[PDB]
């Protein structure tokens, strides 16, 4: 980890990585049964369990690719969206988890809607669709890899950026056209802004080769879904982050405008 | 797997055996590891699951390849490229007569670019140990063993169930920090490198705190000014003894100038300050190397 020599090196392949993990953009219109309404009420769900189970943010964003990388070829029927969902999650706990829940804590939490075994070749077949390409870039990966530019660290900005990226997942809505590392610069730039009054740094402008001009499209989505949060249908992110870990951001009031 | 004739043992794992085959089509010589797939109270081993994953995305000559994974019922087997033996046995091998000089180099050399390929993208091997470098009559040698694996494109922590054997363990880990880094892999290295040159495993540890007692009879008790936070850190003792640094003349005898200081370098307390691969082969001590080959006593 902290050996400066390789942090362009790991943020030029995560660049190239994520655009190759890169789920349909519009494979929902595409798809029978489930909807996009759906989707959010899954990921939410998830929100919680990682919050049952103390899982880190990295697990959720990981299971929440697999979700749409798997939904951009298979079509699932509404009441298997579920176990899809839970195979994504006992999959990325397993890839980034210390040590992962048992499957009986998954096959619980489904209020036993599913089988120990339908989990079990759920994730058999998640795995083959996939191909086991598991190590997938994330926006939580991508904010990492942009707090190390900060002028001082503040960590009620980490936490916000955290917190807009996480809300991110919720709508497919429109957050499935822009690149983890999009939302990431974006999600930085307003929680930064929302809290220290500046702006997305010249050293990250260089490093990403992003200007805040190329975020404007997605800064203005991400600033909407802030300002609209508190009347969202999904609140699980929104209790999650007025808790004391979070530095209670949720909570934090949204500029009325980006001064864009 | 009915292309496969297995031809023989070469071992066991807590979640698997690897056995030598062939494939009877090809005729290519290829490790099956085989999983046998708790389809019940587990699925797919986490261990399986990280290996295959980070494997796949790391071709490199100094890396065992990862050839296929032919995942069905319960049984799950993961392919290799095949090499003839690991420095554990090369070495022993070679107690009497030694491991020649420029053949250390140049495994050094190998390691360290198999190494800073996984470093650069974002993959910690954290179990480098001469049983997982493979090495072949041609005189390449490989990392494998990417069980312990993990990316890092976000903070590893430490588990006290994940962990490389004591000998190669940095202090770091011995001293209880919270996250992993790249350092803890260029311990391991230095740590090897050493060995090579000594015929004798360098801090041969009873236990932790026998471990950390052996490294600082020889580096020295690591203080503030050596490494900023030592003092802070989780099993950290001001009863520690405090010992002085010898001379890596007297350490690894040798060395010349140039392979004592990229060693002193590996060997680094301050895990912020240790070498990285990348840069080590920069090091003026490899301004030379070669690419000899092993007598292997197959
Ligand atoms: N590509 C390979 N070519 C030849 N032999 C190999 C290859 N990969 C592994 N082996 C052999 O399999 C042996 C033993 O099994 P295993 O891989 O489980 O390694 P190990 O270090 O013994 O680790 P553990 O038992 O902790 O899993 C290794 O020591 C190695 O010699």
Same mark, same amino acid.
């Given at each position: 980890?902290?050996?400066? +020599?390789?942090?362009? +090196?790991?943020?030029?392949?995560?660049?190239?990585?994520?655009?190759?993990?890169?789920?349909?953009?519009?494979?929902?219109?595409?798809?029978?049964?489930?909807?996009? #309404?759906?989707?959010?009420?899954?990921? +939410?769900?998830?929100?919680?369990? =990682?919050?049952?189970?103390?899982?880190?943010?990295?697990?959720?964003?990981?299971?929440?690719?697999?979700? +749409?990388?798997?939904?951009?070829?298979?079509?699932? /029927?509404? =009441?298997?969206? !579920?176990?899809?969902?839970?195979?994504?999650?006992l999959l990325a706990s397993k890839f980034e988890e210390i040590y992962p829940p048992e499957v009986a804590e998954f096959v619980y939490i489904t209020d036993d809607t599913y089988t120990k075994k339908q989990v079990l070749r759920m994730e058999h077949l998640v795995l083959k669709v996939l191909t086991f390409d598991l190590a997938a870039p994330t926006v939580n990966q991508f904010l990492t890899q942009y707090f190390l530019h900060q002028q001082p660290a503040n960590c009620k900005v980490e936490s916000l950026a955290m917190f807009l990226g996480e809300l991110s997942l919720i709508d497919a809505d429109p957050y499935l056209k822009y690149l983890p590392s999009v939302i990431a610069g974006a999600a930085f730039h307003l929680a930064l802004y929302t809290v220290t009054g500046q702006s997305w740094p010249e050293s990250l402008?260089?490093?990403? =080769?992003?200007?805040?001009? #190329?975020?404007?499209?997605?800064?203005?989505?991400?600033? !909407?879904?802030? /300002?609209?949060?508190? !009347?969202?249908? !999904?609140? #699980?992110?929104?209790?999650?982050?007025?808790?004391?870990?979070?530095?209670?951001?949720?909570?934090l009031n949204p500029p009325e405008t980006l001064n864009l | 797997?009915?292309? *496969? &004739?297995?031809?023989?043992?070469?071992?066991? $794992?807590?979640?698997?055996?690897?056995?030598?085959?062939?494939?009877?089509?090809? $005729?290519?010589?290829?490790? %099956?590891?085989?999983?046998?797939?708790?389809?019940?109270?587990?699925?797919?081993?986490?261990?399986?699951?990280?290996?295959?994953?980070?494997?796949?995305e790391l071709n490199h000559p100094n890396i065992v390849k990862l050839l296929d994974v032919i995942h069905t019922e319960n049984k799950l087997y993961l392919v290799f490229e095949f090499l003839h033996q690991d420095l554990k046995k090369f070495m022993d091998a070679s107690a009497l007569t030694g491991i020649p000089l420029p053949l250390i180099k140049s495994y050094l050399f190998q390691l360290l670019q198999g190494l800073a390929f996984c470093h650069s993208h974002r993959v910690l091997h954290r179990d480098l140990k001469p049983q997982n470098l493979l090495i072949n009559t041609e005189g390449a040698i490989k990392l494998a063993d990417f069980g312990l694996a993990r990316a890092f494109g976000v903070p590893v922590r430490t588990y006290t169930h994940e962990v490389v054997t004591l000998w190669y363990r940095a202090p770091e880990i011995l001293l209880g920090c919270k996250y992993?880094?790249?350092?803890?892999?260029? @311990?391991?290295?230095?740590?090897?490198?050493?060995?090579?040159?000594?015929?004798?495993?360098?801090?041969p540890g009873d236990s932790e705190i026998d471990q950390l007692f052996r490294i600082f009879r020889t580096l020295g008790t690591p203080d503030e000014v050596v490494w900023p936070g030592v003092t802070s850190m989780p099993d950290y003792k001001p009863? *520690?003894?405090? @010992?002085?640094? &010898?001379? *890596?003349?007297?350490?690894?005898?040798? %060395?010349?100038?140039? $392979?004592?200081? %990229?060693?002193? &370098?590996?060997?680094?307390?301050?895990?912020?300050?240790?070498?990285?691969?990348?840069?080590?082969?920069?090091?003026?001590?490899?301004?030379?190397?070669?690419?000899?080959?092993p007598h292997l006593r197959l």
């Open positions: 980890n902290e050996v400066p +020599d390789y942090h362009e +090196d790991i943020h030029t392949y995560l660049r190239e990585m994520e655009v190759k993990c890169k789920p349909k953009v519009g494979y929902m219109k595409k798809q029978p049964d489930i909807t996009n #309404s759906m989707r959010a009420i899954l990921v +939410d769900w998830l929100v919680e369990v =990682g919050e049952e189970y103390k899982l880190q943010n990295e697990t959720l964003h990981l299971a929440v690719n697999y979700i +749409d990388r798997f939904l951009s070829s298979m079509s699932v /029927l509404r =009441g298997k969206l !579920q176990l899809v969902g839970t195979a994504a999650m402008i260089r490093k990403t =080769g992003y200007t805040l001009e #190329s975020l404007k499209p997605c800064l203005m989505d991400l600033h !909407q879904t802030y /300002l609209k949060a508190p !009347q969202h249908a !999904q609140q #699980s992110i929104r209790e999650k982050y007025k808790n004391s870990k979070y530095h209670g951001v949720s909570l | 797997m009915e292309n *496969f &004739q297995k031809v023989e043992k070469i071992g066991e $794992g807590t979640y698997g055996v690897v056995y030598k085959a062939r494939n009877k089509l090809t $005729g290519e010589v290829v490790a %099956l590891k085989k999983i046998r797939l708790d389809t019940e109270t587990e699925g797919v081993p986490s261990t399986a699951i990280r290996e295959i994953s980070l494997l796949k992993y880094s790249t350092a803890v892999d260029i @311990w391991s290295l230095g740590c090897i490198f050493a060995e090579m040159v000594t015929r004798r495993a360098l801090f009863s *520690f003894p405090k @010992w002085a640094r &010898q001379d *890596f003349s007297k350490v690894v005898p040798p %060395l010349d100038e140039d $392979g004592r200081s %990229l060693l002193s &370098q590996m060997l680094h307390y301050d895990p912020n300050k240790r070498i990285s691969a990348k840069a080590a082969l920069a090091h003026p001590f490899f301004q030379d190397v070669t690419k000899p080959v």
